[PDB]
Design a protein around this nucleic acid. Structure first.
Ligand SMILES: [Mg+2]
Ligand SMILES: [Mg+2]
Ligand SMILES: [Mg+2]
Ligand SMILES: [Mg+2]
Ligand SMILES: [Mg+2]
Ligand SMILES: [Mg+2]
Ligand SMILES: [Mg+2]
Ligand SMILES: [Mg+2]
Ligand SMILES: [Mg+2]
Ligand SMILES: [Mg+2]
Ligand SMILES: [Mg+2]
Ligand SMILES: [Mg+2]
Ligand SMILES: [Mg+2]
Ligand SMILES: [Mg+2]
Ligand SMILES: [Mg+2]
Ligand SMILES: [Mg+2]
Ligand SMILES: [Mg+2]
Ligand SMILES: [Mg+2]
Ligand SMILES: [Mg+2]
Ligand SMILES: [Mg+2]
Ligand SMILES: [Mg+2]
Ligand SMILES: [Mg+2]
Ligand SMILES: [Mg+2]
Ligand SMILES: [Mg+2]
Ligand SMILES: [Mg+2]
Ligand SMILES: [Mg+2]
Ligand SMILES: [Mg+2]
Ligand SMILES: [Mg+2]
Ligand SMILES: [Mg+2]
Ligand SMILES: [Mg+2]
Ligand SMILES: [Mg+2]
Ligand SMILES: [Mg+2]
Ligand SMILES: [Mg+2]
Ligand SMILES: [Mg+2]
Ligand SMILES: [Mg+2]
Ligand SMILES: [Mg+2]
Ligand SMILES: [Mg+2]
Ligand SMILES: [Mg+2]
Ligand SMILES: [Mg+2]
Ligand SMILES: [Mg+2]
Ligand SMILES: [Mg+2]
Ligand SMILES: [Mg+2]
Ligand SMILES: [Mg+2]
Ligand SMILES: [Mg+2]
Ligand SMILES: [Mg+2]
Ligand SMILES: [Mg+2]
Ligand SMILES: [Mg+2]
Ligand SMILES: [Mg+2]
Lengths: 169, 290
RNA sequence: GUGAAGCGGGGCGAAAGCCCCGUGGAGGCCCGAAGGGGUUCUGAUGUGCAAAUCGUUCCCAUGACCUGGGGCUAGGGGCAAAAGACCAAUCAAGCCCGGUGAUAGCUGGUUCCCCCCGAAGCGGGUCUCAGCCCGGCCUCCCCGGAGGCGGCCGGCGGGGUAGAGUACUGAUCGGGGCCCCGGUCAAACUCCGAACCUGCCAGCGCCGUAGAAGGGGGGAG
RNA sequence: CAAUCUAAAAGGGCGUCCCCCGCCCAAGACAG
RNA sequence: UGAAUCCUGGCCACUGGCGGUACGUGAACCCCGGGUACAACCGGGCGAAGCGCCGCUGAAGGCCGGGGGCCCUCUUAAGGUAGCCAAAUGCCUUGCCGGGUAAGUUCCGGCGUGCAUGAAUGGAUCAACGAGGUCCCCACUGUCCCGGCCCGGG
RNA sequence: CCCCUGAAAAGAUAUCGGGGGUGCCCAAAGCUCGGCUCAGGCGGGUCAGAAAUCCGCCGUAGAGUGUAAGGGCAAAAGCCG
RNA sequence: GGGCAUGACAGAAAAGUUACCCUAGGAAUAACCGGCUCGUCGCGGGUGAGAGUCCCCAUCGACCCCGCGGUUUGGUACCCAGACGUCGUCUCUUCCCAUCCUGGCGGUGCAGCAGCCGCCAAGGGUGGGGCUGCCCGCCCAUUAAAGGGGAACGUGAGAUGGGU
RNA sequence: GCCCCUAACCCGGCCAUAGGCGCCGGUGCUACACCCGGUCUCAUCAGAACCCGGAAGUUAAGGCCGGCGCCGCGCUCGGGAGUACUGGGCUCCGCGAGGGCCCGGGAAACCGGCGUGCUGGGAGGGGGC
C-alpha cells in the first residue's frame, strides 16, 4: 500500500459502479455497528458523541478499519458492551486505482509509464465532506470522559482533521 | 473425510520469497517447485505478508544485467478466511480469474495460500454435476475465451503478452492440419529460457565509437520450440474426472479437445472443470454418455 | 647447440638380446647476429622526423624462408593460408571524365527606405504524423444594395448539468414484523431540478448608403 | 504589504491575549 | 573435419539431394469437333521434364522431450549412447564439499534430472610446441611503505 | 463503423480514456389485417410432479421485441392466426 | 443499371539484416548530467494493540495516519544531437549533519565490568589487508572508532583503462 | 332553420386533481344498460364473445351523481430557505486540496396546508325568434 497521502484528495469523479469495474476489491470491514444495537436498549443511552470531519477528502478502508478497532476495543474494555452503541457511519464506496507494472492483471498493465495509464483497482475509500459524521456513539452521561478518549484514539488513525461534538439525543 | 473448508486445503510453499528476492531467483524456485501463488514477506525474520506474486511475475524480467526484485511487482492479494467453504472460494477464483488466494485467520494472521490445484484436488473427491467434457468445454469459435489457439510456427512475441498478462490460461498449439501439436503455458516459459533475449534502454554512448547502442531482438523463437509436446487430448465424451485429475496433478489448466479426426474443436480450461463440479453443464449444452 | 638413419669397438650374457663409448651428420630441430616480422611498455611522438615514426622489449631466422629484375590476372571484375583484407595515402564493390546543375517533404543562406491593413498552429482528407490539399483565420479589388449582431430587457420555446434524491437500475449499514422505519452511495442510476447557454419575434444599444446581408476574383501565410 | 518565488503537516503548549459555558462560595468557597 | 590415440551412438518427420512401376496433375507444338464464305474465337484429346505420390540418403543442414505402464504411448522422426561439465557452454550462483590464503566473487579437485553439454555439427584427450588466456610457489626487486640525492637533454 | 460514459442542461468536443459491440443472420426474424396479453403469484382441477393441458382471480410490464448499448412499445412495436 | 475489391476500409502489388555500415537532418525524440515530480528509496513524527515477571512508552511499536530529504529507482521530455568525453579507481580540495570515535549531559529492566536508548555538538579522527573490473558487500588482523552524504553521479585539455 | 339554458348517451382535447382500495346513499317516462332468442347476415370448441332479431323482466351489476376514510397523485400556498448550488470581479484567507467577500440569479427532499378531474362539439329535453 502507498502512503495514504496519495489518495487523500478528491481529484476526480466517484468510481463506484461495480458492474463496470473489473476486480473491484471486497470490503474488509466485518461490522459497522458495535456495542448494544437493539433499539430498545439504546433508549437507556441519553448522550451522543460524534467524530465529525473538518475537511473534505478520501478515507481509505484500512484507516476506517484501524479507527474502528481502536475505539471499539477501548469502549469494550472501559465502558462495557452493554452500555454504549458505536456506529461507523460512512461506507467505503469509492474504488481506488493505481498505475503500476504488474503480471496477471491484463496485457495493458505490461506497458511501462503513462502509456495506458488507467489504473487497476487498489483499494477502497469513503469520500467525505466537511461536517460529515464519521463515527457516532450513544452512551450514558457517566462515561463521557471514556467516550471522548475512545474518539480521540479513532481520530489518530484518520487521514483528515476531525473534531468531537457531544450533544444530548 | 471430504475437505469442505479452506483450512483443509491450505498449502505452504517449499520456498520463501521476500521483497528482496530477485526475479531470477523466483524463476529458479518455480522451476523446481511450481506453485500458483507466492506470498512475499517483508523480511527474512518476519511472517508479515507484503503481498503476492504469480508465476507470471517471474516473466517480467527484461535483462539479466538489470536489477529486478520481487518487491517492485507486488499484486494486491485476494484474501480469504480459513473458515470459508471450498465452493465459495472457488467462486471467487472464477470471478477474478486468479490462480490462488492468501488465507488468513479471524485476526488476519497469515495462515497460508490456497490454489487452483488444491481446490481441484479437493473437488476430485466428489461427484461432478456434469460428467462429460462435451457439457463444459470452450469452443474454438468463442470470441474471447480464457484459452488461446495458435499455430506451431508463430513467433512467441505474438502471444507473450496474453500469457504474462493472464488474459488466457494457456494456448493450444495447432499443426498445419488443425490438430493439437501441444500446449503452451507460463510453465513452458519458466522451465526453459530458449525464448528469452535480453533488452534494455539505449546505452550511455558518449565519447567513443560504438555503432549499436541499443540491443535489438532479431531471431525470435517459434512456439513449437518451447511448447509442451505430446499432451493427452480429450474428446467430447471424455470423462470430466480424468481431465480434473490431470489438472490437479500437474497444474496445467488447458486441455485440447479434438473431433474424431483429431482436429481441434476447442479446449477444456480449469474454469470449465470447476463449472462441472459446481453447477453442471453450460447453457444450451447436454451431458453426453461417458 | 642438439645428434636421426647408417657404421666401429668394448662389457654382460646360454640364445635372443641388452648396456657403455665413439663415428656419422638428419630435421618446415633449438640459442642467436644479418635479414624478415611487429608482442609489451597501452614508453616517446601525437600543429610529429613521419597523413603510422622512434626507443625498448620481443617473434622467426635451412625454409609453407627473405630479397632484385622480367611477366600474368582489371572493377560487379581481379586477388585473397579468409581480416569482406588488398587492387597507387581511395575499397560491404577503385579511379577518371561523362549522364549531371541527379533528387532532397531535410539543413544553411536569400542584399534599399517609408506608409496601410494584419494572421495561424483549428476541422476534414492523405503510405498521413518534419509534407500537401479543401475549409476556418489575413489581405487586395470588384459586384450588390439595406440591413446586421461579441451586449441587455421582454414575450414565446428548447435543455437535464450543479444540487437534490435513493423513487426506476444497482450498491450499502442497522433496527423491527417478503414488508415497514432510520442511515451510507452512483461517470456509464433519475421522480425533481437551478445558475447558465441557446431558437424565433418585438424593443433597446451599437454598426451601416463615406455601403449591412449576400456574391465573384487575385495573393497568401 | 498577492502569484511566478525558495515552503510546511498530523500532533503538543493557559507561552501569552481574549470569548463563552457548567459548578462552588450568600464571605462557614480554593490552599495550607 | 582438422596431428596422433580411444572413439564416433539413435533419428529420413522437416529442409535438401537422388532413384522409381502405376496413377493424378502438368506448356508450346500437334490432332478432333464447333464457329467463321476465311480468320479471330470456343470445347475436347494427346501429354515431356517437373510436382503430387513411393522409396533411399546423417563423416547432407541438422535433431535427440514428455506421459504412462523393460514394455506401451503422444508430439514435426527419434528420444542424448560413450563420454564430459557451474566448462571460453550453469541464469539461479560468491552453487555445495575439499585444496591453497590471516582473510580466495578468481583458480585447482570432486559432485550433477546439465536455464541451454555431447560425438568428423566431431566427443574424450596435453606428450611436444606457444609474444595464446589464467592460478599457485621460490628467487627478486624503488611496484609499494615513502620518499631522497645525483647524471644528460628539455 | 455503432451504443452508453467522459461531455461542463443548444451545437461541437480529445487522450494507447472507461464499459461493450460490428464485417452478420433471417423467406422470415420481411408486408399487412384481425384477435389476444406478457414475467410472476394465488385458488380449484385424473394421472400431473416446481414445471404440460383446463376453470377463475391478481398482475405498470417486474416479459418479449435476432444480434452491443442506449431509446421506444400493452385493445402494441410483444404472442397467435 | 447489378455484381467481381481494395478491413492500412476517401483504395500501391511487396520479407529480412547490418556490430562493416553510409547520407540528410532532429534536442519535434531516447541514453549520461541538469530541470520538474517523489510513487519508490532513505530519514523523522503522531497513535498505542501487544510484548516487557508486575508495568503501554527502560527497550520496543502490530493496525493505521502526518511529514522531511533529494541520497536509490522510476515518472515526465523542459534545455543540450554543426557533440557538456560514457563505470570504477588514483590524486587533491572543500562543504553538509540525519554523530561511528573523541567533548558535554540525561535515562535505563544503570550493583561493578559491559551494554542499550535520547539530547547538544561537525574542532579533529574515521586507518591496514584478503576476494571481485567493480561500486556494494562478505571476510582477516588491528583500533578510541575504523560514520554517512554533497560538490556537472566534484576532478580523463590531471592520470589510469580492468569492466561496460 | 335560429339563439339561449340544460344529467345520465355519442364523438373528443388535456391525459391520475382523472388512478386504487373500502364504506354509505341517489338515478330508471325517456336515454344507457343488464336482459330475451338464434330463422336470417355473421360467428366460434362454445350465439360466452362477435353478429343478427327483439322487448318479458330488473335497477342486483355497469354507466352517471353525492358523501366519508386511507393510499397514490397535483398545487403560481407556509416552512425548509435566500439554505444547497451558481454567472461576473478580487494583490481576500489558507501550507495545500480549498474557502471567503462584493454585484447578479436561486433550488430539491422533506414537514404542514389545500385539492381529488377540467373542458370542446352533438343528440335528447326546456324557453323564446
Ligand atoms: Mg482530476
Ligand atoms: Mg547504429
Ligand atoms: Mg627452425
Ligand atoms: Mg595496445
Ligand atoms: Mg603510447
Ligand atoms: Mg606533445
Ligand atoms: Mg632464433
Ligand atoms: Mg565480419
Ligand atoms: Mg564497383
Ligand atoms: Mg554499388
Ligand atoms: Mg561523378
Ligand atoms: Mg491594426
Ligand atoms: Mg525544422
Ligand atoms: Mg431571450
Ligand atoms: Mg451530483
Ligand atoms: Mg447524497
Ligand atoms: Mg453547455
Ligand atoms: Mg500536506
Ligand atoms: Mg552423427
Ligand atoms: Mg548422460
Ligand atoms: Mg576436457
Ligand atoms: Mg554443468
Ligand atoms: Mg573458469
Ligand atoms: Mg544438446
Ligand atoms: Mg562444436
Ligand atoms: Mg550441438
Ligand atoms: Mg575435438
Ligand atoms: Mg608460432
Ligand atoms: Mg450538448
Ligand atoms: Mg438491428
Ligand atoms: Mg398488430
Ligand atoms: Mg484512409
Ligand atoms: Mg556533463
Ligand atoms: Mg534524465
Ligand atoms: Mg517509504
Ligand atoms: Mg507512544
Ligand atoms: Mg533522479
Ligand atoms: Mg524537448
Ligand atoms: Mg541548456
Ligand atoms: Mg554545444
Ligand atoms: Mg568540458
Ligand atoms: Mg568538447
Ligand atoms: Mg544535530
Ligand atoms: Mg563526474
Ligand atoms: Mg583524456
Ligand atoms: Mg576535465
Ligand atoms: Mg579494457
Ligand atoms: Mg575485455
Amino acid at each position: 500500500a502507498r502512503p495514504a497521502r496519495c489518495y487523500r484528495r478528491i481529484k476526480g469523479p466517484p468510481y463506484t459502479r461495480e458492474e463496470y469495474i473489473h476486480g473491484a476489491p471486497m470490503i474488509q470491514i466485518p461490522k459497522f455497528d458495535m456495542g448494544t444495537t437493539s433499539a430498545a436498549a439504546r433508549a437507556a443511552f441519553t448522550m451522543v458523541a460524534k467524530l465529525v470531519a473538518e475537511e473534505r477528502g478520501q478515507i481509505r478502508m484500512q484507516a476506517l478499519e484501524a479507527a474502528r478497532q481502536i475505539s471499539s476495543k477501548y469502549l469494550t474494555k472501559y465502558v462495557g458492551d452493554a452500555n454504549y452503541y458505536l456506529r461507523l457511519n460512512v461506507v467505503p464506496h469509492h474504488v481506488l486505482r493505481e498505475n503500476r507494472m504488474l503480471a496477471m492483471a491484463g496485457a495493458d498493465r505490461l506497458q511501462e509509464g503513462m502509456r495506458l495509464a488507467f489504473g487497476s483497482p487498489a483499494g477502497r475509500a469513503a469520500r467525505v465532506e466537511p461536517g460529515q459524521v464519521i463515527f457516532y456513539v450513544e452512551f450514558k452521561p457517566e462515561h463521557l470522559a471514556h467516550v471522548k478518549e475512545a474518539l480521540r484514539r479513532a481520530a489518530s488513525k484518520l487521514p483528515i482533521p476531525t473534531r468531537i461534538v457531544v450533544e444530548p439525543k | 473425510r471430504v475437505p469442505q473448508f479452506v483450512r483443509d486445503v491450505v498449502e505452504h510453499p517449499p520456498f520463501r520469497v521476500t521483497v528482496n528476492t530477485t526475479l531470477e531467483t523466483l524463476a529458479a524456485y518455480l522451476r523446481k517447485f511450481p506453485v500458483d501463488v507466492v506470498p512475499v514477506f517483508k523480511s527474512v525474520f518476519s511472517d508479515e505478508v507484503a503481498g503476492v506474486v504469480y508465476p507470471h511475475t517471474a516473466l517480467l524480467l527484461k535483462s539479466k544485467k538489470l536489477d529486478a526484485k520481487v518487491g517492485e511487482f507486488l499484486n494486491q492479494p485476494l484474501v480469504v478466511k480459513e473458515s470459508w467453504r471450498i465452493e465459495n472460494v472457488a467462486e471467487m477464483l472464477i470471478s477474478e480469474s486468479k490462480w490462488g488466494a492468501v488465507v488468513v485467520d479471524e485476526e488476519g494472521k497469515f495462515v497460508g495460500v490456497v490454489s487452483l490445484r488444491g481446490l481441484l484436488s479437493a473437488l476430485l473427491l466428489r461427484e461432478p454435476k456434469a460428467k462429460s467434457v462435451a457439457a463444459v468445454y470452450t469452443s474454438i469459435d468463442e470470441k474471447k475465451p480464457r484459452v488461446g489457439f495458435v499455430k506451431a510456427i508463430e513467433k512467441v512475441s505474438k502471444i507473450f503478452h496474453k500469457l504474462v498478462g493472464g488474459e488466457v490460461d494457456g494456448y493450444v498449439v495447432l499443426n498445419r492440419e488443425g490438430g493439437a501439436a501441444g500446449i503452451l503455458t507460463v510453465w513452458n516459459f519458466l522451465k526453459s529460457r530458449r525464448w528469452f533475449r535480453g533488452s534494455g534502454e539505449p546505452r550511455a554512448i558518449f565519447g567513443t565509437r560504438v555503432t549499436r547502442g541499443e540491443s535489438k531482438p532479431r531471431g525470435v523463437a517459434r512456439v513449437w520450440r518451447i511448447m509442451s509436446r505430446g499432451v493427452a487430448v480429450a474428446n467430447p465424451d471424455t470423462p470430466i474426472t480424468d481431465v480434473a485429475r490431470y489438472m490437479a496433478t500437474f497444474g496445467i489448466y488447458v486441455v485440447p479437445v479434438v473431433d474424431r479426426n483429431g482436429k481441434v474443436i476447442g479446449a477444456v480450461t480449469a474454469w470449465d472443470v470447476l463449472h462441472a463440479y459446481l453447477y453442471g453443464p453450460k447453457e444450451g449444452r447436454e451431458d453426453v454418455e461417458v
